[PDB]
């Protein structure tokens, strides 16, 4: 425990005998060597930022049965756990996507772009002309009115930096966060 | 055979189900009933809850109550000298241990 | 990862290092102290390891720890549902029988309770009406002061047999119902809401709100809790006599006989392991159904007896069958299998269940019929000859049928909504785990790859051929 | 509805055997009770109780209304004496006459009282295992059984107590019954003879490590109890004829059940040998096995060989007056 | 062993009304409201109060009248306040010609 | 045995000892008993420590307030803090050279040794003025960054945490001192953003943590971090008029000015109990709006904007069924409509759009607003009222009651504030008129009635335009 | 449950049925029977019928009898100092209360 607890709980006469004090120190040392670390592990699991690494691995394995995560991608494991558990509340919005992209890719800032399609269906088939939001106002296609589709396409700045690796990381890690009725189509770079 | 004293909280074998009894005892120890006694921690009782238990009630197996009321988890950490504690009688805690040991039901449970 | 040997060696090294113990005392006094200390330290280490293992939900080994961890991530398990059936004979004996009664209490030959759900016919010769096992009983609690949460906890026996729970509050001669809520998500300062919870001890309770996020039950008011009680799983074959109770005035007048369908739809509460899995998934579920697995989780919770369910969006269908389609936008496809219900009945149930689903807007639901693929195997092996060939064949056939069969639980090992497919390695491991064969070989016949969406691949034990010798 | 409330903090006093008596949520002052007699028998006659309460102000019967149907909450234990046990039970009052500014209360244990009620309607169990019958007859007690083997048929007629069927089950199975401290007990007679003792009682030994007997009675009348069981059982079976069981040199006696297993166990019982009075041990319950050593107090300190080494407890009586706590027991041996 | 009381006559203090928090000062407050309520003045419970008026007009020296009144005072005190321990009574002249002092001791 | 008593361990030692030459002699002796007891103490300590830590691990089974606070992720309102008491005082000026303006936050101490401080600023117009006092005092702690690492933490002492009302962090690098703003869970936090997160230790000690390089900005290696704490005692009171508060720590004004309270300095609060803290810990997210939980727009709009009589939320299929056409542009659209009693349609649009905008929105969905269409209806009544009453009073009462029940500003559409649209039907008017006891007989006729879809149609009664025909019996 | 003293007129729960018992008591108080007691209202008993009830009978819950016999509906209305009152004994009142609580028939009823 402390350096001289089990020794100090002896009677004042017994503390001055050599063998009894030595035996008390030996027993305390044995208990400190073999028992104490597990008790300290038990008591230190209350807060995420105070647990040891094995308990963090246990918690991440508990979280891993439902999501696909790799802890070496982000800088800190407690940040990973706390932010994933916090963004579970923001299911379906753009916040989880944006924050996960920023967290797991060393600080790339990304904005989500929806895709628009022409209303005129008998002359333009549904999936032949698709335009992202940034190029919607600057185009000449579909020669008519538009509507919103359940499709989206990411836009990324060049300075904040390759396309293939970013793609693979996205399909493996971040796409599982998308709703099942939303379709993701490729990358945009500017 | 080696039995247990009737004042021991270990009479309930599951460490999780003992939480109800511990919660009730601690909630009582923070209230202001008329049957409560006020006891200060003397300089020689810093590391010895057994001495406090013997001096207050006359029973030495009630050291878990003294450990609980001070807000500690182990007996190896010292209590602060001069901390005011309020302690209930022994009969109440004894019947409380028996209650959760046998009935176990929570106070206020509605039955038919 | 210490053992007794490591503890003994470390103690011996510590003793040898000591100046006093090594020199002044030797070889008789020390030897028994070594054994005593090593044994005590090993026992303490084992207890600490057990506590550390029981600390977390995934590694828990006792039910109470799992229940506490579930109470932390607020979770209430599914409650037992009553078995239902039909009584077609209610022909009277004398005159002036109950023309059209409703909710008559009954007892049936075992001191078990039944009641009729609907009004009967006038019973010219006979009348038909359905019964369930539900029984009613209430408990009341007065309010002396405003305690700001006023949690009310039921007894263990009442919670054991519980199907529904309704809350009524009476103040100054008017009684009203209070609706339940998921935590306190959008209600405050006048809403009449409550939250259910499960104690580590098997007790179910109701918690009223705070001043800000709810309305405290006002002083001088009475709260009534109405419980629908049912025993879990019983069956009545046919022909037994059901005798009215309380309204026992009709027993001499009327004769009620159990006929036609048996009371056979009973269900019990969850086991420990299913609770362990569902409490873990509830953290990610919350109450919103945006993701793919949320629909299956909700459907499995609402519908009892379901085996497996898969849900896929428009992208999967557009990759699977049709390149592009406007109708596919905001369309959800569901597929499932029910051992005791036909596909049309399951189609009827699923759509009605989805009426109350959360986060329902701009969404259209469709169901696709399942297709079955039989599968088959052939085994060649040798027994040790201590056991007969025929017994081994019968036991292996039965075990394979219960493990990989159509009605098997392999597709959903735990009741959490998921679809798990059969792989070749699984059969190789499972057949070996039995240990009947000294050496065996497997060949797969009529096996097809599954889409994962609407393909179903069970195993056909009857057609498979087993070659056994030695 | 019934609410479970916490014990009050105004009860700071500890007693010898009787700790507190309450009627609902109100307490009778303990100093007013001058007598107490608690009896735990070795058959299904249920635990009994009798309290003598001094009432000179006409309060117990007049203002509290104590008559047929009053439920008492009694806390019995001995957390400091020879045996540190503690438990709580509920009792049902049958009658309470008042004489000489005193009231005598006769009470019966509620879970057994419910078993001693005559039946309004007849119940028959056709081809049922004994466990189902026991659970259906007494659904409020925990079952402790080890001697159930087969299945049979039992009948309970109108006006008969449910205890009769349980005693018949005990006779057919060959076990010993007693309901105490929230349990109902079925324990086989053949396995009881091979049980190791748990306590040691000695006489005329002042350096003993166990307890001490102050008074004891030696009974040598073994024929008085064996006279009733010295018969050869016979019965009629429609497919076998006449079925016999037992010895060959004893008189014949007819019964009705033609079951060989039931016939074989018809003549098993426990033979009482000794009665003793000790200094208030609250751990003595029926079914307990003790080791008894008796020395002589004159001549040359010879051991008494007429008392066997191991004995079983059959009946226990505990008694507390205003000064002393005493126990009495009856000990026996399996035939 | 934790008994607390407020001043029977709510007496103003810097914090508010005075509070007595001990086992010995509580007896002081209880005996303070006694000797302040004459018998019968309490609206409920008419049989609770003080018998000091009967001392009013009698010689300050020793006489059988005082020995009579002290017994009634002690008996009434035992009846009304059973828990408090009281050790004695002392009556004697004090200050001017007319005044008389009565002292009750709690030990 | 899992539960070790002294007897069990002594018995184990005795069982192990036997069959030895040296040890078997001393089986029954004092020394063996003392040694066994001394050893049993450690075993008891370890077993009880494991049990206690396992029990206190969870929130649901925690027995202490500090453990519940430590286990909770957010501390913004899971654990409350003491709040000060306040009151009014008067400042009388004695002699000359007294300052014309009393500085703000002057310290005062009362007859009871408690600290007091005056908010606002006082000016003595003729030697008399009035200000507010607030019971709290400011103390400061300092710390120096000896080394920069991930998750740097600074912890207060127990006495200061017992009386902590506000916490302000000032970090100075070089010559510039800048305040660092707090954050809930590093929400919307990145590099170059200065935030800190509070935490509560298992012992009663508050703390501050700056974390990581990507998610926050670590204070540099050569800076000094200072925490300032405002200290207060909640349930402390001073009576009115009977209190003098001499000046302390600014004693130059003790001779000059005399200060006396005029109103009781009360209304302080204290910390909560364990049960309330745990219950608030489990259900914290209720208190502040974060998202539209469960996609229930009407309840959210009712909650955020008070006074909305009714509101409805559309869908794609509902619009398709309404207009009878498959599609024009109506996909991924959420239409709404509503009516406020005392505001215009465009203003309602603006408020609703702002309230929806404040919360993060759903992906690939856009709101749109449809303005209501008004279709009032009128009734005609012919009946007899008996000779006891008078016609004019009956007509006036009928008009008032009918306008209260059915009308543009009535609560008929949404009696309970749960968001539902309830539509007036023909049976309701007959029943409501029947409940009133004026008429021996009547015969209602509806004029300008319409059938209204529940989405964007408004139907209500115009009492004034309605004509009533009442004749004596 | 809070028990009501056996000398209280609230022992009959209906204010209309209590009128018969009140009528009987008032009729007895105005008669000239030979075991009544004569009591004059003292100057300190003007507003306090409980003091009179305690001084005459020794029981304080019999204040309703004093209020009835004096002729007041309200206890806050002062009595006239020096008014002559005649009050019956306590056992008679208890017997009448018991008869009207457990039987509740008119004093001169004819039964078969």
Whole-angstrom distance, CA of residue E89 vs CA of residue E70: 8
CB spacing of B102 vs D7 below 8 angstroms: no
Contacts with F288 (C-beta within 8 Å, 6 or more apart), sequence order: none
Run of H or E including A87: helix A77-87
Write out the two tokens for F434: 């029947």
Spatial distance between the Cα atoms of A116 and A183, rounded to a whole number of angstroms: 13
Task: Please report the residues numbered 62 through 81 in chain B whose beta carbons come closer than 8 angstroms to any beta carbon of chain D.
Answer: none
Contact between C417 and C281 (Cβ < 8 Å):
no
Q: Which chains touch B (3 or more CB pairs under 8 A)?
A: A, C, D, E, F
CA distance D83 to D81: 6
* Resolution for this experimental structure (Å): 3.2
- Give F146-157 as a DSSP string: SS--TTEEEE--
| Contact indicator for G40, G82 with CB cutoff of 8 Å | yes
Torsion of CA A80, A82, A88, A92, to 10 degrees: -60
Instruction: Report yes or no: B112 at the F interface, CB cutoff 8 Å.
Output: no
Q: Output phi, psi for A185, to 5 deg.
A: -130, 90
F192: region left, alpha or beta (phi > 0 left; psi from -120 to 50 alpha)? left
- Taking contacts as CB-CB distances below 8 angstroms, the residues of chain D near C201 are none
In DSSP notation, F287-306 reads: SS--S-GGG-HHHHHHHHST
Residue D323: count of CB within 10 angstroms of its CB: 6
Residue D9: burial class (beta carbons within 10 Å; 0-12, 13-18, 19+) = middle
Chain C CB within 8 Å of residue B105 CB: yes
The partner residues of C382 in beta bridges, in order of sequence, read C439, C469
Looking at the DSSP bridge assignments, the partners of residue F167 are F229
Alpha helices in C124-190 (DSSP H): 156-160
DSSP characters over E10-39:
--B-SSSB-EEESSHHHHHHHHHHTTTSBT
- Report the C-alpha gap between C106 and C113 in whole angstroms: 6
C209 neighbors C182 (Cβ within 8 angstroms): no
E16 vs F: CB within 8 A: yes
Residues of C in contact with B106 (CB under 8 A): 153, 199, 201, 203
Q: What is the DSSP letter of A171?
A: I
CB contact under 8 A, A150 and C292: no
CA distances from F160 to F155, F205, F207 (A): 10, 8, 11
Instruction: Tell me if C200 and F61 make a contact (CB, 8 A cut-off).
Output: yes
**Cα–Cα–Cα angle for D28, D34, D36, nearest 5°?**
90
Distance between CA atoms of D3 and D25, rounded to whole angstroms?
11
Pick the closest to residue C238 from C101, C97, C102, C109 (CA basis).
Answer: C109
E103 touches chain B (CB under 8 A): no
The answer, for A75 touching chain F at a CB cutoff of 8 Å, is yes
Strands F445-447 and C179-180: unpaired
Q: CB–CB of B37 and E2 under 8 A?
A: yes
Nearest by Cα to F4 from F48, F35, F34: F48
User: Nearest CB to F63: which of B23, B75, B76?
Assistant: B23
Cα separation, F423 vs F313, in Å, equals 16
| CA of F306 vs chain A CAs: smallest distance (Å) | 25
The tokens 């933490």 sit on which residue? Answer: F153
Q: Obtained via which technique? A: cryo-EM
Contact C62, C54 (CB under 8 A): yes
In sequence order, the β-bridge partners of residue D253 are D233
Between CA A27 and CA C326 the distance in angstroms is 77
Structure tokens belonging to residue F319: 């619009």
**Min distance C215 CA to chain B CA atoms (Å):** 22
Strand order in the sheet with F164-173: F137-144, F224-231, F164-173, F176-179
Cα–Cα distance for residue pair D116/G104, rounded to 1 Å: 40
- DSSP readout, A93-117? BHHHHHHHHHHHTTS---EEEEEEE
Residue C221 touches chain B, beta carbons under 8 Å: no
Could you tell me if C377 and C448 are in contact, meaning their C-beta atoms sit under 8 angstroms apart? no
List C-alpha distances in Å: B27 to C151, D11, D145. Answer: 17, 19, 41
Which of D1, D13, D86 is opposite residue B110, by nearest beta carbon? D1
Two structure tokens written together for D228: 């009733």
Contact B76 A43 (CB under 8 A): no
G42–E contact, CB cutoff 8 A = no
Q: Do chains B and E touch (3 or more CB pairs under 8 A)?
A: yes
Write the CA distances from A113 to A90, A162, D59, integer angstroms.
Answer: 19, 20, 87
* CB < 8 Å from D in window 26-65 of B: 33, 35
Q: Identify the sign of the CA torsion B24, B26, B29, B32.
A: negative
d(CA C431, CA C399): 9
- The distance from CA D196 to its chain's CA centroid, rounded to whole angstroms, is 21
Can you spell out the DSSP letters for B32-86?
--TT-EEEEPPGGGSS-HHHHHHHHTS-GGGHHHHHHHHT-S-SSSPPPTT-EEE
- CB-CB contact of C141 with C152 (8 Å): yes
Half-sphere exposure of F11 (CA within 13 A, CB side): 8
Q: What are phi and psi of A111, to 5 degrees?
A: -125, 145
Rounded to whole angstroms, what are the CA distances from C399 to C128, C388, C430?
43, 17, 10
Cα gap C115→C131, rounded to integer Å: 5
Contacts of D124 in chain C (CB under 8 A): none
CA distance D137 to D151: 16
Distance from the Cα of residue C5 to its chain's centroid: 46
Interchain proximity F60–C186, CB inside 8 Å: no
Q: Are A152 and A170 in contact (CB under 8 A)?
A: no
Rg of chain D over CA atoms, in angstroms?
23
- Spatial separation of the C-alpha atoms in residues F51 and C51, rounded to whole Å: 8
Select from B35, B95, B99 the residue whose CB has the most chain D CBs within 10 Å, as the one to mutate to test that interface.
Answer: B95
| Nearest-by-CA chain G residue for E40 | G51
Per DSSP bridges, beta strands F101-102 and F122-123 are antiparallel
Per-residue DSSP letter, F408: T
In angstroms, the CA C121 to CA C139 distance is 34
> What are the C-alpha distances in Å from F109 to residues D148, F106, F117, F259, F358?
84, 10, 8, 11, 46
DSSP string of D121-164, one letter each residue: S-EEEEEE-HHHHHHHH-TTSEEEE------EEEEE-TT--HHH
* Alpha carbon separation from C180 to C183, C192, C401, F278, F419 (Å, rounded): 9, 8, 44, 21, 16
Residue pair A130/A148 in contact by the 8 Å Cβ criterion? no
Residue of G47, G60, G66 to mutate when probing chain E, most E C-beta within 10 A: G60
Query: Residues with Cβ < 8 Å from E101, sequence gap 6 or more?
Result: E91, E92, E93, E94
Of F11, F49, F63, the CB nearest to B22: F63
Contact A150 F291 (CB under 8 A): no
Q: Is residue A43 less than 8 Å (CB to CB) from chain B? A: yes
Measured between beta carbons, which residues in chain B are less than 8 angstroms from residue C142?
none
Which residues of B fall within a CB distance of 8 Å from C202?
none
Tokens 């497997």 correspond to C442
Number of H helices, E strands in chain D: 5, 24
Nearest CA in chain C to D1: C139
Residue A85 backbone class (left: φ over 0; alpha: ψ -120 to 50; beta: rest): alpha
Minimum Cα–Cα distance from A28: chain B residue: B76
CA distance F3 to E95: 74
Neighbours of E, requiring at least 3 CB pairs below 8 Å, are B, F, G
What's the length of chain E? 107
Query: Exposure string (b/e) for B21-37, b if CB count within 10 Å is 16 or more?
Result: bbbbbbebbeeeeebbe
Query: Is some CB atom of chain B closer than 8 A to the CB atom of A11?
Result: no
- Helix (H) or strand (E) run with residue E68 in it: helix E64-80
Q: Is B96's CB within 8 Å of D6's CB?
A: yes
Give the Cα separation of C124 and C92 in Å (integer): 9
* Strand-strand pairing, F366-369 and D48-54: unpaired
CA–chain centroid gap for G94, Å, is 10
Residues D316, D295 contacting (CB under 8 angstroms) = no
CA Rg, chain B, in Å?
A: 15
CA-CA distance, F327 to F319, in Å (whole number)?
Answer: 9
CA distance E11 to chain F (A): 13
Contact B2 F7 (CB under 8 A): yes
Sheet of C113-116: strand order equals C84-87, C129-132, C113-116, C105-107, C243-244
As a dihedral over the C-alpha atoms of residue E69, residue E71, residue E72, residue E75, rounded to 10 degrees, the angle is 160
Q: Is B96 on the interface with D (CB under 8 A)?
A: yes
List chains touching A (3+ CB pairs under 8 A).
B, C, F
Tell me phi and psi for residue G45, to 5 degrees.
Answer: -110, 20
Q: CB pairs below 8 Å between B and E: how many?
A: 13
Distance CA F157, CA F161 (A): 6
Query: How do F366-369 and F333-339 pair as beta strands?
Result: parallel
**Nearest residue to B11 via CA among B59, B61, B53:** B61
DSSP string, F10-28: HHHHHHHH-S-TTGGGGSS
CA dist list (Å): A148 to A117, A126, C315, D214, F202: 7, 12, 16, 100, 53
């Amino acid at each position: 425990m402390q350096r001289s607890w089990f020794n100090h709980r002896l009677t004042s006469a017994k503390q001055k005998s050599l063998l009894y004090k030595s035996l008390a120190d030996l027993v305390q040392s044995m208990m400190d060597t073999f028992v104490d670390p597990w008790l300290e592990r038990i008591t230190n699991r209350k807060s995420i930022f105070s647990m040891s690494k094995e308990d963090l691995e246990t918690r991440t394995n508990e979280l891993g049965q439902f999501f696909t995560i790799r802890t070496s991608n982000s800088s800190s494991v407690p940040m990973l756990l706390q932010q994933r558990l916090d963004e579970i509340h923001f299911k379906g919005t753009e916040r989880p996507i944006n924050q996960t992209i920023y967290r797991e890719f060393n600080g790339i800032s990304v904005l989500w772009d929806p895709i628009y399609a022409p209303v005129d269906l008998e002359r333009h088939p549904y999936g032949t002309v698709l335009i992202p939001e940034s190029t919607l106002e600057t185009t000449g296609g579909t020669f008519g009115e538009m509507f919103l589709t359940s499709r989206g396409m990411i836009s990324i700045p060049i300075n904040d930096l390759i396309t293939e690796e970013i793609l693979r990381k996205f399909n493996q890690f971040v796409k599982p966060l998308l709703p099942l009725h939303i379709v993701f189509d490729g990358l945009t770079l500017y | 055979q080696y039995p247990l004293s009737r004042y021991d909280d270990r009479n309930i074998a599951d460490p999780i189900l003992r939480a109800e009894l511990r919660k009730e005892v601690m909630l009582m120890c923070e209230s202001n009933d008329k049957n409560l006694t006020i006891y200060y921690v003397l300089p020689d009782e810093q590391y010895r809850p057994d001495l406090l238990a013997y001096r207050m009630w006359g029973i030495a197996e009630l050291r878990w109550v003294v450990t609980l009321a001070a807000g500690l988890e182990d007996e190896s950490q010292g209590m602060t000298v001069g901390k005011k504690l309020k302690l209930p009688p022994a009969t109440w805690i004894r019947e409380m241990i028996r209650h959760f040991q046998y009935d176990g039901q929570v106070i206020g449970t509605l039955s038919i | 990862t210490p053992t007794k040997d490591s503890i003994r060696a470390e103690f011996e090294e510590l003793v040898e290092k000591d100046s006093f113990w090594s020199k002044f005392v030797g070889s008789q006094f020390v030897s028994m102290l070594t054994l005593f200390i090593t044994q005590i330290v090993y026992r303490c280490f084992q207890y600490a390891d057990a506590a550390l293992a029981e600390g977390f939900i995934s590694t828990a080994t006792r039910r109470s720890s799992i229940l506490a961890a579930a109470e932390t991530n607020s979770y209430v398990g599914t409650k037992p549902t009553p078995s239902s059936g039909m009584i077609e004979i209610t022909a009277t004996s004398e005159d002036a029988p109950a023309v059209i009664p409703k909710n008559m209490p009954l007892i049936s030959d075992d001191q078990y309770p039944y009641m009729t759900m609907d009004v009967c016919r006038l019973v010219d010769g006979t009348g038909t009406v359905e019964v369930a096992q539900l029984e009613i009983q209430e408990v009341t609690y007065t309010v002396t002061a405003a305690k700001e949460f006023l949690e009310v906890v039921l007894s263990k026996a009442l919670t054991a047999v519980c199907y529904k729970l309704e809350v009524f509050v009476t103040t100054d001669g008017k009684t009203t119902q209070w609706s339940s809520s998921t935590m306190f998500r959008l209600a405050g300062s006048k809403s009449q809401v409550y939250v259910e919870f499960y104690k580590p001890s098997e007790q179910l309770g109701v918690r009223f709100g705070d001043g800000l996020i709810g309305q405290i039950p006002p002083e001088g008011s009475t709260i009534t809790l109405k419980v629908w009680c049912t025993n879990g799983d019983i069956t009545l074959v046919a022909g037994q006599n059901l005798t009215p109770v309380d309204s026992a005035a009709n027993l001499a007048n009327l004769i009620s006989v159990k006929t036609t369908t048996p009371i056979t739809a009973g269900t019990d509460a969850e086991t420990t392991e299913i609770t362990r899995n569902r409490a873990q998934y509830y953290l990610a579920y919350d109450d919103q159904v945006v993701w793919g697995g949320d629909y299956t989780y909700f459907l499995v919770r609402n519908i009892p007896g379901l085996s497996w369910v898969k849900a896929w969006g428009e992208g999967q269908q557009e990759k699977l069958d049709g390149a592009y389609n406007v109708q596919n936008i905001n369309k959800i496809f569901i597929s499932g299998w029910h051992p005791n219900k036909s596909q049309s009945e399951l189609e009827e149930m699923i759509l009605a269940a989805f009426k109350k689903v959360p986060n329902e807007l701009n969404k259209k639901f469709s169901y696709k019929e399942v297709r079955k693929l039989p599968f088959k195997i052939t085994i060649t092996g040798r027994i040790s000859a201590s056991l007969t060939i025929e017994n081994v064949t019968d036991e292996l056939k039965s075990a394979l049928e219960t493990k990989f069969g159509r009605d098997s639980t392999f597709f959903d090992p735990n009741r959490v909504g998921k679809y798990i497919l059969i792989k070749k390695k699984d059969v190789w491991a499972f057949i070996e785990t039995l240990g009947y064969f000294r050496d065996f070989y497997l060949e797969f016949v009529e096996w097809n790859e599954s889409n994962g969406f609407y393909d179903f691949v069970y195993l056909d034990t009857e057609n498979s051929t087993f070659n056994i010798s030695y | 509805t019934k609410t479970t409330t916490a014990p009050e903090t105004d009860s700071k006093r500890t007693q010898l055997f009787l700790q507190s008596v309450s009627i609902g949520q109100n307490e009778i002052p303990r100093e007013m009770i001058v007598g107490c007699t608690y009896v735990e028998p070795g058959e299904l006659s249920g635990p009994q109780l009798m309290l003598m309460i001094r009432d000179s102000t006409a309060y117990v019967v007049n203002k509290l209304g104590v008559k047929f149907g009053t439920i008492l909450t009694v806390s019995l234990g001995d957390p400091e004496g020879h045996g540190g046990i503690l438990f709580s039970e509920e009792f049902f009052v049958l009658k309470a006459p008042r004489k000489d500014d005193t009231v005598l209360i006769y009470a019966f244990s509620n879970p057994v009282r419910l078993l001693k009620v005559p039946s309004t309607s007849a119940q028959y169990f056709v081809d049922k295992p004994p466990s189902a019958v026991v659970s259906s007859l007494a659904p409020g007690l925990k079952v402790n059984a080890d001697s159930f083997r087969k299945t049979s048929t039992y009948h309970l007629n109108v006006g008969e107590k449910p205890t009769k069927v349980l005693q018949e089950i005990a006779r057919d199975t060959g076990s010993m019954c007693w309901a105490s401290r929230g349990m109902i007990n079925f324990k086989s007679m053949e396995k009881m003879a091979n049980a190791a003792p748990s306590l040691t009682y000695e006489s005329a030994n002042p350096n003993t490590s166990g307890f001490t007997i102050s008074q004891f009675n030696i009974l040598n009348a073994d024929y008085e109890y064996q006279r009733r069981h010295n018969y050869r059982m016979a019965s009629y079976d429609m497919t076998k004829g006449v079925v016999y069981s037992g010895n060959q040199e004893d008189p014949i006696k007819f019964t009705s059940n033609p079951d060989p297993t039931a016939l074989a166990n018809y003549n098993k019982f426990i033979l009482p040998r000794l009665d003793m009075l000790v200094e208030g041990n609250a751990a003595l319950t029926p079914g307990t096995t003790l080791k008894i050593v008796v020395h002589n107090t004159a001549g040359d300190g010879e051991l008494d060989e007429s008392i066997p080494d191991k004995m079983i407890v059959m009946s226990v009586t505990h008694f507390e007056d205003r000064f002393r706590f005493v126990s009495r027991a009856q000990l026996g041996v399996v035939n | 062993a934790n008994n607390n009381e407020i001043d029977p006559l709510l007496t103003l203090e810097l914090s508010g009304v005075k509070t007595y928090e001990s086992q010995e000062e509580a007896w002081g407050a209880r005996l303070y409201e006694w000797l302040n309520t004459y018998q019968g003045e309490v609206y409920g419970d008419p049989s609770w109060g003080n018998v000091l008026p009967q001392f009013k007009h009698e010689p300050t020296n020793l006489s059988h009248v005082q020995i009579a009144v002290e017994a009634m005072l002690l008996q009434k005190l035992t009846v009304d306040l059973p828990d408090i321990p009281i050790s004695g009574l002392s009556v004697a002249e004090g200050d001017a010609f007319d005044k008389l002092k009565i002292s009750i001791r709690i030990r």
